[PDB]
């Protein structure tokens, strides 16, 4: 049978912390994706179209991790695409049908399976409008007919007879960090006016949560592509508390990754709660999202990691709060 959307989110929960709405949007679409694919395809039965998703969120919020985490249990062909390598048909670069070639390769060129797969297109915000915009609007236009059902003509599994792939039922998840999108939403929601007769109006998570096509059009996406991404799911910006859970709760938590490296030696690595909050706070100030957690941990551990493989008798190393706030050595337990 099919897993319920709650089971999909439960699996996503082992990897992504926060973004409850983005996890919900992905889980429901994938569940509906499954249902559509087992729906009768002939007779008096209504034809079912698909709802594609656009993921809008800040750097290091978990967009790509959601897609990668989702992929672990999809049971349909899944591919990670990259919009920065796409160009118009007549130019250097990859054409939009290259995506289908990659999805098709993932299932050993079994087309019937490729047509049931799910495509994640990363960096969708990088092909916005803001001559011939070969790598920008030209790609958005080329994708219009790939996202909506067409028949892609892609090379065979050998060297360059081409394969006809019906993309009608391929689910597309697009996303990116629309960095300039908050200013547009603020301009629309806080217009106001200047001068007497006119009235003057009051002045990331909140703004993205209210995004509308008008903003994406002014940002630089074309209306024809926006309407083909009917579901807009947003990711918030991680705060100090979310960044603490990301250090220890996930299946591949940052702390767990270092404990494993120290575990290839015979030394146990422990962080104090004061350190975890200090790390999360410092990382938050770097404005790189969760990624900033790695810089802090690499920083505080650099000198103990240098010595560790040469030290003999060490059993446990403790990273206290002081080791994050001040240039202190971690306590070494022999």
């Amino acid at each position: 049978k099919l897993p319920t959307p709650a089971e999909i989110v439960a699996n996503l929960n082992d990897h992504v912390i926060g973004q409850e709405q983005a996890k919900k949007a992905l889980a429901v679409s994938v569940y509906n994706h499954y249902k559509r694919l087992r729906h009768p395809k002939a007779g008096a039965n209504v034809e079912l179209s698909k709802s594609n998703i656009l993921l809008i969120g800040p750097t290091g919020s978990g967009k790509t991790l959601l897609a990668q985490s989702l992929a672990r249990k999809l049971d349909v062909p899944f591919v990670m695409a990259d919009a920065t390598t796409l160009t118009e048909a007549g130019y250097v670069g990859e054409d939009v049908e290259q995506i289908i070639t990659k999805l098709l390769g993932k299932c050993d060129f079994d087309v019937e399976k490729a047509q049931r797969g799910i495509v994640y297109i990363d960096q969708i915000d990088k092909i916005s409008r803001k001559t011939r915009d070969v790598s920008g609007e030209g790609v958005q236009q080329a994708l219009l007919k790939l996202i909506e059902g067409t028949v892609a003509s892609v090379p065979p599994q050998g060297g360059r007879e081409f394969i006809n792939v019906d993309t009608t039922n391929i689910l597309f998840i697009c996303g990116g960090a629309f960095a300039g999108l908050e200013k547009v939403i603020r301009q629309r929601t806080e217009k106001g006016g200047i001068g007497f007769g006119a009235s003057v109006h009051s002045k990331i998570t909140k703004l993205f949560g209210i995004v509308e096509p008008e903003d994406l059009i002014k940002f630089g996406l074309i209306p024809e592509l926006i309407g083909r991404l009917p579901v807009i799911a947003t990711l918030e910006i991680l705060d100090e508390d979310a960044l603490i859970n990301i250090l220890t709760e996930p299946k591949n938590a940052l702390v767990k990754q270092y404990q494993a490296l120290f575990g290839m030696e015979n030394v146990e690595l422990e962080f104090e709660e004061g350190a975890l909050r200090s790390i999360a706070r410092q990382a938050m100030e770097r404005k790189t999202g969760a990624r900033g957690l790695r810089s802090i941990v690499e920083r505080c551990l650099l000198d103990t990691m240098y010595r560790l493989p040469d030290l003999k008798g060490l059993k446990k190393v403790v990273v206290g709060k002081a080791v994050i706030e001040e240039g202190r050595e971690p306590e070494l337990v022999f």
Partner: protein, 186 residues
């Protein structure tokens, strides 16, 4: 004068306008008063709730020009805080006292001077014309003393005495009088 450029590249006054600082420097004229009004209007829209900081270093000027600033200050939603730098004399002192109550400031060695108006315009022509202009000047005199008395929480009779001749005040005397609320040091 060469106005420095600071980093988009601003001249240093446009840069300070971005911080909601409006300067009234030198005599109050139709042109210098209308720039203050234009800046006050512009800032209200950029943010109706945030305070506007109106820095005053002025010997005085036209009453009608000063009143265009005064009415704009009172009209726009955001509080206009006023600060006296160097001096606030005549209409400059009026506009200083016109700041939002509790947000009228002076620097420690600033000089604040209040006085009845002088000629708002010449009094030539016929005795009938001179009578008219004398009456208009007296109405302005009363209006300014009345608005000053309101600003300072004083009786109209006190402002009528005190503005009879040039009344120079230190920042402390202006605070005691009621023209300013606080004196800044650091």
């Amino acid at each position: 004068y060469l106005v420095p450029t600071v980093i988009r590249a601003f001249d240093i006054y446009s840069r300070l306008l971005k911080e909601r600082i409006v300067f009234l420097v030198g005599p109050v004229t139709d042109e210098s008063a209308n720039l203050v009004v234009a800046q006050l209007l512009f800032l209200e829209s950029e943010n109706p709730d945030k305070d506007i900081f109106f820095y005053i270093n002025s010997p005085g000027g036209s009453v009608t020009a000063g009143m265009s600033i005064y009415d704009t200050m009172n009209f726009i939603k955001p509080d206009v805080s006023t600060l006296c730098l160097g001096q606030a004399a005549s209409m400059g002192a009026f506009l200083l006292s016109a700041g939002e109550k509790g947000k009228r400031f002076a620097l420690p060695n600033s000089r604040i001077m209040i006085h009845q108006p002088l000629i708002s315009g010449g009094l030539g022509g016929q005795a009938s014309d001179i009578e008219i202009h004398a009456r208009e000047l007296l109405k302005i005199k009363e209006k300014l003393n009345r608005l000053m008395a309101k600003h300072c929480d004083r009786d109209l009779a006190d402002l009528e005495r005190d503005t009879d001749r040039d009344n120079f005040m230190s920042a402390e005397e202006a605070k005691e009088y009621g023209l300013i609320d606080q004196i800044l040091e650091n």
